[PDB]
Design a binder for this molecule. Sequence first.
Ligand SMILES: CCC[C@@H]1C[C@@H](C(=O)N[C@@H]([C@H]2O[C@H](SC)[C@H](O)[C@@H](O)[C@H]2O)[C@H](C)Cl)N(C)C1
Ligand SMILES: [Mg+2]
Ligand SMILES: [Mg+2]
Ligand SMILES: [Mg+2]
Ligand SMILES: [Mg+2]
Ligand SMILES: [Mg+2]
Ligand SMILES: [Mg+2]
Ligand SMILES: [Mg+2]
Ligand SMILES: [Mg+2]
Ligand SMILES: [Mg+2]
Ligand SMILES: [Mg+2]
Ligand SMILES: [Mg+2]
Ligand SMILES: [Mg+2]
Ligand SMILES: [Mg+2]
Ligand SMILES: [Mg+2]
Ligand SMILES: [Mg+2]
Ligand SMILES: [Mg+2]
Ligand SMILES: [Mg+2]
Ligand SMILES: [Mg+2]
Ligand SMILES: [Mg+2]
Ligand SMILES: [Mg+2]
Ligand SMILES: [Mg+2]
Ligand SMILES: [Mg+2]
Ligand SMILES: [Mg+2]
Ligand SMILES: [Mg+2]
Ligand SMILES: [Mg+2]
Ligand SMILES: [Mg+2]
Ligand SMILES: [Mg+2]
Ligand SMILES: [Mg+2]
Ligand SMILES: [Mg+2]
Ligand SMILES: [Mg+2]
Ligand SMILES: [Mg+2]
Ligand SMILES: [Mg+2]
Ligand SMILES: [Mg+2]
Ligand SMILES: [Mg+2]
Ligand SMILES: [Mg+2]
Ligand SMILES: [Mg+2]
Ligand SMILES: [Mg+2]
Ligand SMILES: [Mg+2]
Ligand SMILES: [Mg+2]
Ligand SMILES: [Mg+2]
Ligand SMILES: [Mg+2]
Lengths: 136, 179, 78, 58, 23
Amino acid sequence: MLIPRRVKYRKQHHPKRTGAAKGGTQLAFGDYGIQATEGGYLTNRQIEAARIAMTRYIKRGGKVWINVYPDRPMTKHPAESRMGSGKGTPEWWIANIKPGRVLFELSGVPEDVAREAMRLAIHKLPMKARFISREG
Amino acid sequence: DIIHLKAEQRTEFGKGAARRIRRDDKVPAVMYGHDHDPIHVTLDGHATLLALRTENPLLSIEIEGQKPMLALPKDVQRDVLKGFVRHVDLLTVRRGEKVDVNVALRITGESAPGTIAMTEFNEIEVQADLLNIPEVIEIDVTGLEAGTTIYLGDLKLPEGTSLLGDAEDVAATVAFPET
Amino acid sequence: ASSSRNGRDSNAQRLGVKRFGGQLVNAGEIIVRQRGTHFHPGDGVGRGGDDTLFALRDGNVEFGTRRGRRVVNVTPVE
Amino acid sequence: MSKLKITQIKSGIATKPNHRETLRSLGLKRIGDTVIKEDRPEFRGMVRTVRHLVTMEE
Amino acid sequence: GKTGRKRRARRKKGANHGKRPNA
RNA sequence: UUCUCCCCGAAAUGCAUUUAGGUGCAGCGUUGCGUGGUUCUUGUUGGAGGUAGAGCACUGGAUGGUCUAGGGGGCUUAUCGGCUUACCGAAAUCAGCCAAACUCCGAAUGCUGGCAAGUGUAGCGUGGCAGUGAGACGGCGGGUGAUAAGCUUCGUCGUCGAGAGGGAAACAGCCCAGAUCAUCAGCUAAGGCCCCUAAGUGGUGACUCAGUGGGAAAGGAUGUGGAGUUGCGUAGACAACCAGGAGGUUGGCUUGGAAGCAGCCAUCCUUGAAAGAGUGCGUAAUAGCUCACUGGUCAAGUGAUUCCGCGCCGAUAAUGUAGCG
RNA sequence: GUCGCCUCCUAAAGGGUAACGGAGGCGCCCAAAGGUUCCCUCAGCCUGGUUGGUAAUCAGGUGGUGAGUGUAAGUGCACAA
RNA sequence: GUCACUCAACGGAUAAAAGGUACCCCGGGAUAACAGGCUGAUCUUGCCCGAGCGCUCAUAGCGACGGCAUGGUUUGGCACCUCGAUGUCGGCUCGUCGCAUCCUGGGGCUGGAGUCGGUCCCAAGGGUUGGGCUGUUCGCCCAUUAAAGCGGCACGCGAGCU
RNA sequence: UUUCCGGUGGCCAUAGUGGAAGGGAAACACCCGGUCCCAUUCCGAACCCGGUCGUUAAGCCUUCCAACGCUGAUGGUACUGCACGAGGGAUCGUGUGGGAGAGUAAGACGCUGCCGGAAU
Ligand SMILES: CCC[C@@H]1C[C@@H](C(=O)N[C@@H]([C@H]2O[C@H](SC)[C@H](O)[C@@H](O)[C@H]2O)[C@H](C)Cl)N(C)C1
Ligand SMILES: [Mg+2]
Ligand SMILES: [Mg+2]
Ligand SMILES: [Mg+2]
Ligand SMILES: [Mg+2]
Ligand SMILES: [Mg+2]
Ligand SMILES: [Mg+2]
Ligand SMILES: [Mg+2]
Ligand SMILES: [Mg+2]
Ligand SMILES: [Mg+2]
Ligand SMILES: [Mg+2]
Ligand SMILES: [Mg+2]
Ligand SMILES: [Mg+2]
Ligand SMILES: [Mg+2]
Ligand SMILES: [Mg+2]
Ligand SMILES: [Mg+2]
Ligand SMILES: [Mg+2]
Ligand SMILES: [Mg+2]
Ligand SMILES: [Mg+2]
Ligand SMILES: [Mg+2]
Ligand SMILES: [Mg+2]
Ligand SMILES: [Mg+2]
Ligand SMILES: [Mg+2]
Ligand SMILES: [Mg+2]
Ligand SMILES: [Mg+2]
Ligand SMILES: [Mg+2]
Ligand SMILES: [Mg+2]
Ligand SMILES: [Mg+2]
Ligand SMILES: [Mg+2]
Ligand SMILES: [Mg+2]
Ligand SMILES: [Mg+2]
Ligand SMILES: [Mg+2]
Ligand SMILES: [Mg+2]
Ligand SMILES: [Mg+2]
Ligand SMILES: [Mg+2]
Ligand SMILES: [Mg+2]
Ligand SMILES: [Mg+2]
Ligand SMILES: [Mg+2]
Ligand SMILES: [Mg+2]
Ligand SMILES: [Mg+2]
Ligand SMILES: [Mg+2]
Ligand SMILES: [Mg+2]
């Protein structure tokens, strides 16, 4: 689970889900990547599930990078309660993903096994994603 | 090799004009250099795509009225999701003059099965010549393991291509598997 | 249930620039309410106890720089 | 000075108040009403403020 | 629900230019 | 809360309130007198800004690399000291990042002055009379709520309120358009032109065969039409049909059986035109059928991959077809 | 739970703007911590030095604001406020 | 000139004031309880990926970690009709509808030898018991049956009854 | 008039930080003293006074270096006023105007006013 050591403000407005990726649209760590073609909120559990999928498929070879960190706290209203009486406490940690953001990087592994591992990892994310490489 | 690209003059500027140009299967480009003002041209989209398939290619821009001009594509604005080239910066070059470029990196070594090698950079700064642009620079790491590191100061560089960037940073790293 | 432990805000203070560049003012007219000296008093402009900048004479407001300071001047009307 | 000919083709109902005062300033009162203005930058600015409501000729 | 989805779908008709009262 | 017509025509906001469905003052209506372009629109010329966007300079958050002060565990053995530092590792630095309460930056708009033109007759002062101070929906920018509500609370524009006419099947708030009356004249707007239903079963060129049109997701798929990139190919390509379709070698940790199909592995060598210590079926376990490849009659195209247009499945409530009126 | 006042965000780059929205403060203190005049520059880091160690005190270099500001926060202030 | 207010509910009804009402009495659907409406967190029913389990073997039967939806019968959220009354729980009586099928009918796959099953595909024609306890619905139990289905209809049905 | 230099402003890094070399005619500066006016929360270090000996070592000044820092287009892109359009929905696109931030090419080892000195 990725949870920040501490955050300045535990109750924050919802991150904007508008616009293409501000940065991190090009591979910078690995030789292959998962690039998000859709925006959304990527929770820490989805990140962990994708990481487990990639790491278990690729076994012992190469390294996996998580380019996105879930440091945005999303609050939850008290259950079965009416509206008002303040904001809820944080329940989920998310990363704000925009189309064109490289989510995961993979290296030290040939292209077919990399493709299969990243297919497995992509089937865990809530948005659409694609396999990218460094022009071969 | 020199790739010849047909270009024609660009006189409408703005997001709307660029949108129309890209809807007409073309690419906006600006060509700037040392002894002339920037020249705004538009290029064939597919020909530019094929020419920019390679990195650091020597282009000959052909404008009907004017003479041919030698150039290197310095900045290529591509679409992030699709692959289409959106804008080309063309730095004009002289035949008898050096050029600074970014040459590519790859690993072709084969270490012990447990340990794996990594590349820590994308492209590296190199001063070279026009008719000799190296395709890539190879670093072969075969049987080198543990905490060995490779910096940019000792690489088998080709002739005519000196080294410009800081030689005090690593480009390749071999290490144990991921634990 | 629970309750909100916030809810207090101070009244609006209506600070900011009251006379912009080139505006004709009388002597004593307030040019900007401010906390601290974001603007400094220039030529023909005085600074108040609450850092209010006011016209020391008749003329036209102009905003500029004097040495390293960002200042408001009131240039006398020709 | 080509004496712009401006005619109103759409109504002012449900447009921004800026657009309605622009139509009033041009001397346009009804859909299909026409005015002749001098070719000056202020009248061209008025025309391009409400270009979705008018047509212009010379 | 069918009723609400049809209410929100009615806004896609030609003479309503993408909008309708109550969405 | 009772007759008429003529002209104008709101508000559902702000502040305060033993106040919150009341009221006062202000805002918005009207009207007498006064002052007259002072208002408004556009252009142009100045001004302050810190939002959008972006960035990492500061403050926090953060991924990986290089290097390292210092902590852990052990050793010869500890008063040191060395062997470790293969574990952890502050900070420093390189690269990619994140922020309503971050900013080295920084719009468009809006706001506010000068000038110019245009302009309904707008604006302002001062008196008489008010009503209103329950708003609704829609577009754009936000907070609450779950990326919820025909939800709630703000900013701004529009409409309804208080607005008829035409369109949206019907359908306050959507679109067009603001009804002085008459007209058995014409042109148009939005929307339409096979019939209901006025006007084209219009012309030309493509696509769809799902009644898609005339609802929906992740995802699945030799549907179909088109456009690129790339591999093999009359030195004869892919499919089909005839022969070698196997040697040492039952290579190994297993497992009474892993000899080719339990899994993981260094993932070779050979009679040789030819073969992989092994891909499916078979199979207590071995046999075997048959795959990649080599020659033959034939033989003109075959195999991937990217994208685009329109389609398919996923699809799923209860009176009656019933998601084109 | 709240009720008056102050600071920041929401607040959409003038001002204003709501919710039982998100953060904090105040109901003081100071005869100097007011007035004026004159002078001075910090925190951090590095090195050397008795007690003394990371950190009391001294010396040299570096360091521009990261120190400080009676008190929240913001705007300011090193020309120093 | 100055002083006296936690008049702090801070524009400050009095100098001076706590509670009960099921004995209660005299506008609002501006506002709650039932039902309808919207939403769908929760609930429910499915599905996607396939780690792994199944002696071997992902997919006979399964299905971690994750992801996407249906329905609108649950608990809620909203407060849109109704407070010059929309009677409400359970049962009885009378039904009618859906299919997400409990039985009977047809089929594919099986870790289907047979007898029996499991599972998911069609399928709503007919059928789908009587009692003990409890106001119950629900549930446990007794004896059966081919089976003792799940839901909607104002949690169907009080100008039909209790 | 010009050249060099000493003061005094304006712009406030294109000016600074760093390096290398060179120069002092008048001026500046270190420097030498502390008797005198004056001073150190101790110290003639500093402030102040008397000199101008010695010295260009540092300040200062001239020149060279893009090295760190600073400045920085054109074009494109984000965004956006107004007008529309698309999607089941997060959201997206177009027309017509405006248009960054980053980055690239590049600039840059300061510009300028007044007073004075020496020589001309
Ligand atoms: C939870 C119940 C909700 C309310 C009940 C209903 C109501 O008012 N019912 C009445 C009821 O009273 C008698 S029948 C006893 C009348 O005959 C009947 O029509 C109805 O008005 C009584 C309160 Cl029971 N309301 C319309 C809604
Ligand atoms: Mg970046
Ligand atoms: Mg003062
Ligand atoms: Mg004061
Ligand atoms: Mg009227
Ligand atoms: Mg009221
Ligand atoms: Mg009133
Ligand atoms: Mg932003
Ligand atoms: Mg009100
Ligand atoms: Mg309102
Ligand atoms: Mg609204
Ligand atoms: Mg509402
Ligand atoms: Mg109206
Ligand atoms: Mg109407
Ligand atoms: Mg009709
Ligand atoms: Mg009229
Ligand atoms: Mg006609
Ligand atoms: Mg039309
Ligand atoms: Mg007809
Ligand atoms: Mg026909
Ligand atoms: Mg036709
Ligand atoms: Mg249909
Ligand atoms: Mg679909
Ligand atoms: Mg129809
Ligand atoms: Mg503001
Ligand atoms: Mg604003
Ligand atoms: Mg308000
Ligand atoms: Mg009060
Ligand atoms: Mg009293
Ligand atoms: Mg009563
Ligand atoms: Mg109501
Ligand atoms: Mg209800
Ligand atoms: Mg009803
Ligand atoms: Mg639903
Ligand atoms: Mg309401
Ligand atoms: Mg009645
Ligand atoms: Mg069925
Ligand atoms: Mg039946
Ligand atoms: Mg009932
Ligand atoms: Mg720049
Ligand atoms: Mg530009
Ligand atoms: Mg720029």
